[PDB]
Amino acid sequence: RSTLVHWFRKGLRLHDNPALSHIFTAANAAPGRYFVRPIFILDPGILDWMQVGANRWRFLQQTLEDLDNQLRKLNSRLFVVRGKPAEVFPRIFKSWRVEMLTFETDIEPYSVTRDAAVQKLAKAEGVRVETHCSHTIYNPELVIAKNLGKAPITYQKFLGIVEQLKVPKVLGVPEKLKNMPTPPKDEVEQKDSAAYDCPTMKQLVKRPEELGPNKFPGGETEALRRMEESLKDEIWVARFEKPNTAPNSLEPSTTVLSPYLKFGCLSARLFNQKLKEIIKRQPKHSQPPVSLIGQLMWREFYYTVAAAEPNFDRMLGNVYCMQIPWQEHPDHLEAWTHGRTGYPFIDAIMRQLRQEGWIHHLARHAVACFLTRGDLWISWEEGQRVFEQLLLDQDWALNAGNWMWLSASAFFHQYFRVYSPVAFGKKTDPQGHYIRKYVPELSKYPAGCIYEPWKASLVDQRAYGCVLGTDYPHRIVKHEVVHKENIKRMGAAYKVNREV
Ligand SMILES: Cc1cc2nc3c(=O)[nH]c(=O)nc-3n(C[C@H](O)[C@H](O)[C@H](O)COP(=O)(O)OP(=O)(O)OC[C@H]3O[C@@H](n4cnc5c(N)ncnc54)[C@H](O)[C@@H]3O)c2cc1C
């Protein structure tokens, strides 16, 4: 008896999962010949390549538990294998007599490298590998082909390409496994009946004092519930315009499906299909780029440009990226990283990010503009790394692509438009309720100076119980001065890049 293996990496779902569906149908169309091992590998190698903060570890822990729970409802289970894929797969290919291995493809360079190796090993041991592109709606390889070998570098050109592509068929959940025995323990399972059980919170979260509020629980079950809740107001869905959603409402103004889409707890193909059904029903609706479908297409757009560029997450060697002489300023980077810049709006966003792991798109604009071209003139690569640590929805392509946009390094070139860290929040939160929540030491400042506490006299600062320089920091830079200087620096950088 030989085993069929589905390998979860992203695609942490049962629904719309061709790679997992195929394994299950095969076992049921040939009962008694096959064992089924759906596995997730806790790969120590990823940690040399990315930073993972406490909140995202908890999201993953919750996700694996949910996935295990869901697979048990199909008379299977999740097997979580600790170890490096390069060492894990030779062992299990033999110990399990693996006939077929399936998985969902991914475009990240670490994935491409790791997957090539596993495919060279699988080819040697005569294991059939079947892969499916279901993390994105469109296959970036096909978008690039249709555009004659280059990724489209504007959203509009990208949309014109993908309109002519076939939308994939969205699958349901696999059928339960008919009359399948629990596979026989292997070398590892026999010395430890739990060697493959889902990690506990304690095993994955080494810094539990860094966990914030548990607001967006991991897993497909929660993803589908949140999707269904977001889709209940069909008018809100149909008429959604991303630029008009508030970054500093106390409740999120957008769907917060991004963590679920990042891990593939939610199929983007399913979400796209559900959105299209509502749009069909609601004749007055928005269009890309600002519509909700438009948002999924931004994800597709960045996945496509990123697929063509292994250096997408760095300035050097990145075909898209303007070479800009960013400066090193460790103290300013640290103040930004910890929300101690002395601009309350910026600090509120960075504290929400650290505590909760999600901030709105335009809140990400504000802080990324401040770090890079707007104020501190620090490389977007530094911002990317902090976001990588703190965001539940950390996504190699999306983080890099939007950082390049916000820093005017690629895709966006109107660097003379600079967010103000004082004025920008006021449009949608003139009372500063968001600042009061995340910078509570300012909570007694009136609306007239809560965005600009340095405009309060010392007497009033003492009265409000928050003296600048003691209880809340002084501004680390004066926006009105530095952002004018940075516009000149950017223009110089654009000139140099144009001459090369
Ligand atoms: C500096 C910076 C870094 C970012 N890093 C990430 C990241 O690491 N991971 C991430 O998922 N998004 C990232 N984004 C994009 C965007 O801000 C988030 O996708 C969005 O805030 C998710 O919130 P939401 O799910 O409520 O989005 P909604 O507005 O409800 O959109 C639905 C989905 O569309 C996609 N989407 C929406 N906006 C964008 C966008 N601008 N680019 C790409 N896809 C988009 C996401 O999958 C999102 O879940 C970043 C943006 C900026 C400016």
Author numbering: 5 to 504
Provide passages from the article that reported this PDB entry.
Here, using femtosecond X-ray crystallography, we report the structural changes that take place while electrons transfer along a chain of four conserved tryptophans in the Drosophila melanogaster (6-4) photolyase. Photolyases repair DNA lesions using light as energy source.
Next, we turn our attention to the conserved salt bridge between Asp397 and Arg368, which is located on the opposing side of the FAD compared to Asn403.
